[PDB]
Structure 1
């Protein structure tokens, strides 16, 4: 796109598509979430319900907060607690047709923002890296 087109673009045109987004389910236990986070290398990822609607975010710090005990790391709790119980639910959301400037503003305070369609089906994530890389092209030239 040319610079006089970037502001008119949509969030969906620059998001990471959902089939490339690591995620877990609300009903998974924290051991499964910790394995997915660690193996994919990400510090926080979306949490979906079985019908593919976003309900929250789960991250390593949330999980460790649940198992750092008084005397020891209580790793047995990883199999006893579900993602639902500790996930972050107050998160912003974008629509695939949202103007990209709405996404630009939301990533000031958020490393990524989840994107859904009009029926709340999860569609992908809008990340700071993609924003920064594209603004890279247009401030320069």
Structure 2
């Protein structure tokens, strides 16, 4: 894309596709979510329902806050609590056809924003890195 086209593009053209996005499900326990976060190295990831609709975000700091006990880390709670009981549900959302400038504005306060289609099926994520890489390339010109 040329500079005069970039600001005319859509969020979907620059999102990380869902098949490359690490995620978990509302009904998984915190142990599984902590495993996925730790093994993928991401600090927060999408939470989907069984029909692939976005319901929230789950991150390592959220999980640790739920098991940090008075005197010890209550690791047994990882198997006893589900991610939907701990996940953040007030998250921003983008549509695949949203103008890219909307996404540029939404990553000011968010490291990534989830993207969905007309039927609320999860389509991928719109990340700061992709924005910064692209804007750098074009500013430099």
TM-score by length of 1: 1.00
Q: Secondary structure at the match of 1:125?
A: strand
What does residue 103 of structure 2 align with? Answer: 103
Where structure 1 has 5 or more consecutive residues not aligned to the other structure, the ranges are none
Can you list the C-alpha shifts for 1:101-139, whole angstroms capped at 9, x where unaligned?
000000000000000000000000000000000001110
Deviation of the 1:3 alpha carbon? 0.7
Can you list the C-alpha shifts for 1:30-66, whole angstroms capped at 9, x where unaligned?
0000000000010000000000000000000000000
- State how 1:45-64 maps to structure 2 within 5 Å: 45-64=45-64
Q: Secondary structure at the match of 2:12?
A: helix
Deviation of the 1:10 alpha carbon? 0.4
Task: Provide the alpha-carbon RMSD of the alignment.
Answer: 0.3
Where structure 2 has 5 or more consecutive residues not aligned to the other structure, the ranges are none
What does residue 67 of structure 2 align with? Answer: 67
Q: Secondary structure at the match of 2:58?
A: strand
Can you list the C-alpha shifts for 1:84-111, whole angstroms capped at 9, x where unaligned?
0000000000000000000000000000
Counterpart-to-counterpart distance in 1, 2:74 and 2:94: 37
Deviation of the 1:22 alpha carbon? 0.1
Deviation of the 1:71 alpha carbon? 0.5
